[PDB]
Write a protein that binds this ligand. Structure first.
Ligand code: SF4
Ligand SMILES: [Zn+2]
Ligand SMILES: [Zn+2]
Lengths: 98, 149, 714
């Protein structure tokens, strides 16, 4: 929600992206996150989680539904690879506009 | 023992259930502590009904239903008659027809006058007592002894 | 995907099949070719159904005369719905391949309560209520009165079906239960009776066991028409228990009192009938002289003559006598008594009730009660239960036993004693299925070793093969933890149950496992009392609060409403990131009914080997009789009863679609060779000695690493 509030007023041309480095599999939230997923899809904010030591289901659906990618750290060397991969700009999909 | 108690006296049965029903020609609930009550005065008379009893007409039973008490006792006496085995009759219907008449006799004796039943039973006595009653009566002990083991 | 099976060519809808599927199809075809009953096990909850159905369809096409039809039975209606979905997909695939419709029919039967279109019976949900109401509406009396067309609610759907469906059968198609309700509404016919008639001409019929095992209702629809049909039972490893339940009848004091009251109503109704209509209803006596459903199977059932009970009064007196005998025999306070033949002999001696007249008691009850034009059978149902018991006991006691419990368990003194008539061997009740049908395939998942099943159920199997799931990835990584952080034996023995250290080890293991495991976890205990004791000890200590912090915790209770609400919330917890830890009992109906899939019950935890209490006397008859006959050791059968149950309650996570998941058994007993051997092959072969007896910490670490491996894509 904080990221959405800041990114809502961002220009349409630029690609809004979020990389959640998830560590604790639990997610205690005041409101259901599935509802927030709808707003994220409407706002075309790409969310690509990187889980740690856990294949979290809610973040699996978050990544695939919102268009981002989900991954889990095999080890530190693979962690470097994952973040370096996310460095590069992501391809623009049909929802993306220029 | 689940009965609330005697039509007369229920203190004993409410508390401890050792007392057992006593069967009578009245088909009529009674309890030992009240059997003494009947022995002292009348000596074989139902308290409310006043039905006469030859010698106390008392035998231990444990069936709360008085109708069942009378029905079972009457059936016990009836079984002494018409005890011929089924295989004695090759006819398919005759296997259970006579049992139908036996059940009719039991029900007739329970409520309706037993004069006709007694006269009929005398007729059946004169014929069955010669062979069938004696044979089945003797074979009852044999079959029971084999069945028990 | 056409597979060139050894026997023939078999179509298949999905693109690829694992080698276990090839082995399954070839073994199944071998059994079908031998035309002999057999048993086989397949790991996957889903996939086996499609392979089995496709192979049966192809075999039907190749040798239509060999197999008349397929009778595929499933545990529960919610489960059999998924089977009809699979069959519909297969039929659409085959129809597209052929380019045209073929004379193939497939349908599922279900209770009138589950499916019906009459608004009056819609609001009520009780099965007995629906049965009684439908019997009233469809009663021969209601039908004859409908011919008169008098002002009275008559159920038009059955009448219209009689007029139309009798003339025209449904051409073909696949109809789910829900869709069949819509068809019945549209055509003004019964979704129930229409399917019942289609059973005569249906290629595939699917219904639960109680539609095919209990002689009361199974026989009528499983008549000899299917002389040579492929009957298949799916996931029917708990077949002995259900087959026993189909025979066991429980008599209680409250039920007996209700029976007495109902009998009083019966007598009053008979008097009213005599004063109102006597001759027309007396014609029943004539037809009786010539000579709720009977519980006697095909050959055991007899219909020579009703016996000495030829009139309403005589039969009512007979029921009074038998009910009095049962009432007193139950009121006796004493140790548990067993008396299979002696009970019949004592009944006959004490109350003068011959076994032959007692044999036809229930059948004559059905006929005589029909004569009375009663409002419904729901009110008199307890009397019918007692009548079924009355006829069964006089029918046979060679492989049965009457157990009397003046005192119930869990109560030092209770005024509601119960008389059980539990069976001891399931072969008696399942004999007609094997004998009538040319071949029966008991396909099961999580099946404990097949060798016992022929001993329990008297049949000569053709094939005995265990199929191991093979995938490019190790979907399942089971483990057994017997040593805690204290290196202390953690066996959940009866004498070791009270041990606070063992309870603490279980709590700590659950805490760490919930910390590392992703959302969704289910823990199965051995009993409600044991689960409550462990929960209370954890509550007294701080372990439970920490588990609550780490993840949400839900618990199971005997009450179905609370169970349903808790599970409904558990699913939402699994969907969200909170996660959930569902504590349940292995024997709990929730464990058997529920199915765990991807992101549901990710890590299945088994707290203690599931063993039934060694005091329930019913199991004593069931067990010692198996020792005497079929020569099964008491310990052997007991451990089998534990391993089969545990495999049932731990085999859910591998449902289908290759969804990862780990099965952890927190009991050193599972580490014993006998338990491992009796464990299903597919799980055991994955299990290895390296992880056989991991400590709590070591198991947690390996679980974390395995979850890491499964997280990444193929
Ligand atoms: S006759 Fe058919 S429609 Fe009427 S209550 Fe019975 S099942 Fe329902
Ligand atoms: Zn008295
Ligand atoms: Zn009297």
């Amino acid at each position: 929600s904080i990221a959405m509030q800041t990114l809502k007023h961002m220009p349409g041309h630029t690609s809004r992206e979020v990389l959640i480095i998830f560590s604790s599999l639990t997610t205690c939230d005041p409101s259901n996150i599935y509802d927030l997923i709808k707003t994220l899809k409407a706002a075309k904010i790409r969310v690509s989680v990187i889980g740690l030591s856990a294949e979290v289901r809610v973040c699996t659906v978050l990544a695939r539904e919102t268009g981002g990618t989900y991954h889990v750290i095999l080890d530190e060397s693979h962690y470097k690879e994952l973040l370096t991969h996310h460095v590069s700009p992501p391809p623009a999909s049909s929802s993306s506009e220029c | 023992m689940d009965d609330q108690g005697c039509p007369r006296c229920k203190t004993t049965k409410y508390r401890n259930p050792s007392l057992k029903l006593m069967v009578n020609v009245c088909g009529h609930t009674l309890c030992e502590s009240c059997v003494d009550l009947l022995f002292v005065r009348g000596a074989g008379n139902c308290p409310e009904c006043g039905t006469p009893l030859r010698k106390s007409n008392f035998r231990v039973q444990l069936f709360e239903d008085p109708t069942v008490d009378k029905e079972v006792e009457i059936r016990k006496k009836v079984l002494k008659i018409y005890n011929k085995r089924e295989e004695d009759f090759p006819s398919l219907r005759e296997y259970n027809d006579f049992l139908e008449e036996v059940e009719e006799i039991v029900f007739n004796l329970t409520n309706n006058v037993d004069l006709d039943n007694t006269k009929k039973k005398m007729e059946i006595y004169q014929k069955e007592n010669k062979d069938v009653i004696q044979k089945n009566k003797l074979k009852l002990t044999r079959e029971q002894e084999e069945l028990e083991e | 995907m056409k597979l060139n099976v050894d026997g023939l060519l078999v179509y298949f809808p999905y693109d690829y099949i694992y080698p276990e599927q090839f082995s399954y199809m070839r073994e199944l075809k071998r059994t079908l070719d031998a035309k002999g009953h057999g048993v086989l096990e397949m790991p996957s909850g889903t996939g086996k159904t499609v392979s089995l159905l496709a192979l049966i369809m192809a075999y039907q096409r190749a040798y239509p005369l060999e197999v008349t039809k397929l009778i595929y039975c499933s545990r529960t209606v919610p489960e059999i719905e998924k089977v009809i979905e699979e069959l519909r997909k297969l039929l659409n695939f085959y129809e597209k391949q052929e380019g045209e419709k073929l004379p193939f029919l497939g349908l599922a039967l279900s209770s009138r309560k589950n499916l019906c279109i009459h608004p009056e019976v819609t609001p009520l949900r009780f099965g007995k209520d629906v049965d009684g109401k439908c019997h009233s509406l469809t009663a021969s009396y209601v039908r004859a009165q409908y011919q008169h067309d008098t002002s009275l609610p008559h159920c038009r759907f059955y009448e219209e079906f009689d007029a139309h469906g009798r003339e025209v059968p449904l051409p073909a198609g696949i109809y789910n239960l829900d869709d069949l309700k819509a068809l019945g509404r549209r055509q003004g016919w019964c979704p129930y009776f229409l399917a019942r008639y289609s059973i005569l001409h249906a290629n595939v019929v699917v219904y639960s066991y109680h539609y095919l095992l209990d002689p009361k209702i199974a026989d009528l629809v499983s008549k000899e028409l299917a002389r040579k049909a492929v009957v298949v039972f799916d996931e029917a490893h708990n077949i002995d228990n259900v087959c026993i339940d189909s025979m066991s009848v429980n008599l209680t004091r409250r039920t007996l009192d209700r029976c007495q009251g109902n009998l009083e109503t019966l007598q009053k109704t008979v008097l009213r009938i005599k004063e109102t209509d006597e001759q027309r209803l007396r014609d029943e006596y004539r037809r009786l002289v010539e000579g709720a459903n009977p519980v006697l199977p095909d050959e055991v059932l007899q219909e020579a003559v009703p016996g000495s009970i030829r009139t309403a009064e005589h039969f009512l007196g007979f029921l009074r006598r038998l009910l009095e005998y049962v009432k007193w025999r139950l009121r006796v306070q004493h140790v548990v008594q067993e008396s299979p033949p002696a009970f019949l002999s004592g009944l006959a001696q004490r109350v003068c009730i011959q076994r032959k007249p007692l044999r036809f008691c229930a059948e004559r009850l059905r006929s005589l009660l029909h004569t009375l034009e009663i409002t419904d059978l729901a009110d008199f149902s307890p009397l019918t239960l007692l009548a079924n018991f009355a006829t069964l006991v006089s029918t046979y006691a060679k492989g049965f036993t009457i157990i009397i419990e003046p005192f119930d368990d869990r109560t030092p003194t209770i005024a509601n004693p119960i008389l059980h008539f539990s069976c001891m061997d399931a072969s008696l009740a399942i004999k007609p299925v094997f004998e009538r049908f040319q071949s029966v395939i008991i396909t099961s998942g999580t099946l404990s070793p097949l060798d016992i099943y022929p001993k329990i159920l008297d049949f000569h199997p053709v094939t005995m093969a265990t199929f191991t799931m093979t995938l490019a990835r190790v979907c399942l990584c089971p483990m057994i933890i017997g040593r805690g952080n204290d290196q202390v034996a953690i066996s959940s023995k009866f004498e070791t149950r009270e041990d606070i250290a063992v309870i603490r080890n279980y709590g700590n293991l659950l805490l760490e496992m919930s910390a590392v495991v992703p959302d969704g976890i289910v823990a199965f205990f051995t009993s409600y009392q044991y689960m409550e004791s462990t929960v209370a000890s954890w509550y007294e200590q701080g372990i439970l609060e920490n588990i609550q912090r780490n993840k949400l915790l839900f618990i199971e209770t005997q009450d179905g409403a609370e169970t349903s609400v808790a599970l409904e919330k558990y699913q939402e917890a699994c969907e969200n990131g909170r996660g959930a830890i569902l504590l349940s009992v292995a024997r709990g109906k929730v464990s058997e009914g529920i199915d765990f899939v991807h992101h549901y019950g990710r890590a299945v935890i088994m707290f203690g080997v599931p063993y039934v209490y060694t005091q329930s006397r019913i199991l004593k008859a069931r067990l010692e009789y198996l020792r005497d006959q079929f020569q099964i050791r008491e310990n052997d059968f007991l451990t089998f009863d534990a391993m089969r149950h545990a495999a049932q309650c731990v085999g859910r996570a591998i449902r289908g679609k290759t969804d990862y998941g780990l099965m952890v058994f927190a009991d050193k007993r599972f580490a014993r060779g006998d338990k491992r051997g009796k464990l299903p092959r597919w799980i055991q072969e994955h299990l290895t000695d390296a992880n056989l007896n991991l400590t709590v910490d070591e198991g947690v670490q390996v679980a974390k690493y395995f979850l890491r491996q499964m997280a990444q894509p193929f």
